Structure 1
């Protein structure tokens, strides 16, 4: 997250860290045994880290749980990043509490201009590399499809939306993929891709979660 602020420990209790040795992606807890992330975050052998704030120091509220299944969307296209969503089942159910809590799935899509909370442990610099110990947060609006398509000609499918600031300075970044975009208490987006970070006219591009709510429900019921 570039241009954000320190969230405060466990203030975003649905935020998880995906870990294959080190933190590489975020994700969102949607119930005690399931996590939503990006399909491009797929790895075998992921360990999910819930209740994190400082990912580099065990502080006492964490739950580390192995992924038993990681299910990429069946229409995921790695070339265009169309359908960039993945469901991760936890080997054992998490213990839900005030620091480890699920986030609701949408019951309608969000509209442009709606303010969202985007979070993660990704790079904080638009020019350079600086990874934070603690969870970073960014409030950003959803952008109009025309703005998104103008920034990224021919690249934006109906399963994507842009969020951020066309003037630059405030964006998600590498290390944030798969993490949440929450709007009015609903998971509307997943960190997916962008051209650079926090660059002018290059806003973040996010998987449109409302297009997948049946898939999520059916995948959960089926596994």
Structure 2
């Protein structure tokens, strides 16, 4: 996250870190046994780390749980990033508490101008590379469809939305991928792609979770 702020320990209790011997992507806990992330974050050997703040120090409240299944959307396209969504089943159920909690799926889509919270352990620099120990947060609005298409002509499908700031300096970044965009207590987005980080006129692009509620429910119900 570039131009954000320190969230504070466990203030984003649905935020998870996906770890393969290092932090590689974020994700969102949606019930005690299932996590939502980006399809482009797929690999084998995923360990889900819940209740994290400092991802480099054991502080208390952490639960490390191996993924038993990682389910990429069958229509995920690795070149366009259309359908950039993946479900991860945990080998065992997380124990839920004030510091490890699920986030509700949306009942309807959010409108342009809705303020959201984006969080993650990604790069905090627009220029060069700096990775934080602790979780970073950013408040950001969802942009209009016309602004989003103007920013990324021919690249925005109906399964994507833009959020952030056209002036530059505030954005999600590498390492934030797969993490949550939460608007009034609902998971509306997943960190997906963008052109550089925090560049003028190049906002972040996010998977539109409201288009996938039925698929999520059906996939969970059958696994």
**Which TM bucket (shorter chain)?**
over 0.9
Structure 1 ranges of 4+ moved more than 4 A: none
Residues 1-25 of structure 1, C-alpha deviations (whole Å, 9 max, x = no match): 0000000000000000000110000
Shift of 1:179: 0.1
Residues 55-100 of structure 1, C-alpha deviations (whole Å, 9 max, x = no match): 0001010000000000000100001000000000000000000000
Shift of 1:222: 0.5
> In 2, distance between residues paired with 1:144 and 1:17?
30
TM-score when scaled to structure 1?
A: 1.00
Shift of 1:136: 0.1
> In 2, distance between residues paired with 1:114 and 1:184?
9
**Counterpart in 1 of 2:71?**
71
> In 2, distance between residues paired with 1:148 and 1:85?
20
Matched, 1:7 2:7: yes
> In 1, distance between residues paired with 2:145 and 2:205?
11
Shift of 1:43: 0.5
Q: Secondary structure at the match of 1:26?
A: strand
Shift of 1:123: 0.1
> In 2, distance between residues paired with 1:222 and 1:170?
39
TM-score when scaled to structure 2?
A: 1.00
Q: Secondary structure at the match of 2:106?
A: coil
> In 1, distance between residues paired with 2:222 and 2:72?
14
Residues 18-48 of structure 1, C-alpha deviations (whole Å, 9 max, x = no match): 0011000000000000000000000111000
Q: Secondary structure at the match of 2:21?
A: coil
**Counterpart in 2 of 1:54?**
54
Q: Secondary structure at the match of 2:146?
A: helix
- Where do 5+ consecutive residues of structure 1 fail to align? none
Shift of 1:139: 0.1
How many residues in Structure 1 have an aligned counterpart in Structure 2? 223
